[PDB]
């Protein structure tokens, strides 16, 4: 089972990806998470991606396609995988088709989680992350027990660098221009499936699981 989770910033890709991989046990491949890992390590890629990420811009295609090609070749992807946040440009999508073909695979579904831009703005700005364990909270939609404190570890909660309002507005605009044309690209191949992301987390998961059910049928 080869899947792609596609959505504008804050649509709920990670939230759902975590639920999906816990149910099937396949790898969760997130380009944003890989770039952040490279930044922490201090690698050449991490240094370059930092500048784009901090501004809310997309990292250039060649660089991004490259780290994905490397990740997809590993043995852990033999039983399938979940791509989160890639592809997000038409060219990354063309690159993905060929990249998969090289390892004898094709996508099953490209799950488009649709949410209104005004809600996405709120999803991102109110998001808070634990500095110790990475647990995610949301001041509006799902706050911690105690303000600024992580329920799991008692750690410090903070706002991701790119989650401030000005950077969010940029993120939304560039992703809307680059990512939205992918709806028609995938609809043409028959891979596209739309999910209403403006529902409670478990309900969104059930619509996804319902879709995934048609694979085992
Ligand atoms: N392919 C690529 N090409 C080029 N450059 C690339 C690239 N991929 C990455 N990059 C670069 O890396 C950067 C970061 O990428 P990335 O880290 O991928 O950011 P993103 O795609 O913009 O979106 P998010 O990760 O922040 O949100 P998400 O959809 O996962 O939602 P989440 O589940 O967290 O949910 C968000 C919040 O909402 C909450 N939430 C989720 N669902 C619900 C719900 N149903 N109801 C209420 N709250 C909800 C969560 O609790 C959370 O607080 C990019 O800006 C770019 O610079
Ligand atoms: Mg994410
Ligand atoms: Zn914590």
Swiss-Prot record:
- Main localization is cytoplasm
For this protein, the record's Gene3D superfamilies field holds: P-loop containing nucleotide triphosphate hydrolases
Which portions of the sequence form the region NMP?
30-59
The temperature dependence reads: Optimum temperature is 65 degrees Celsius. Thermal denaturation midpoint (Tm) is 74.5 degrees Celsius.
The compartments listed are: Cytoplasm
Q: Where is this region: LID?
A: 126-163
Q: In which pathway does it act?
A: Purine metabolism; AMP biosynthesis via salvage pathway; AMP from ADP: step 1/1
Q: Where does Zn(2+) bind?
A: 130, 133, 150, 153
- Coiled-coil ranges (or none): none
Example of a GO cellular component annotation carried by this entry: cytoplasm
Q: Does the keyword DNA-binding apply?
A: no
Q: What is known of its domains?
A: Consists of three domains, a large central CORE domain and two small peripheral domains, NMPbind and LID, which undergo movements during catalysis. The LID domain closes over the site of phosphoryl transfer upon ATP binding. Assembling and dissambling the active center during each catalytic cycle provides an effective means to prevent ATP hydrolysis. Some bacteria have evolved a zinc-coordinating structure that stabilizes the LID domain.
User: PANTHER family from the xrefs?
Assistant: NUCLEOTIDE KINASE
Q: What is known about its subunit structure?
A: Monomer.
Protein name as catalogued:
Adenylate kinase
Give the organism, scientific name. Answer: Geobacillus stearothermophilus
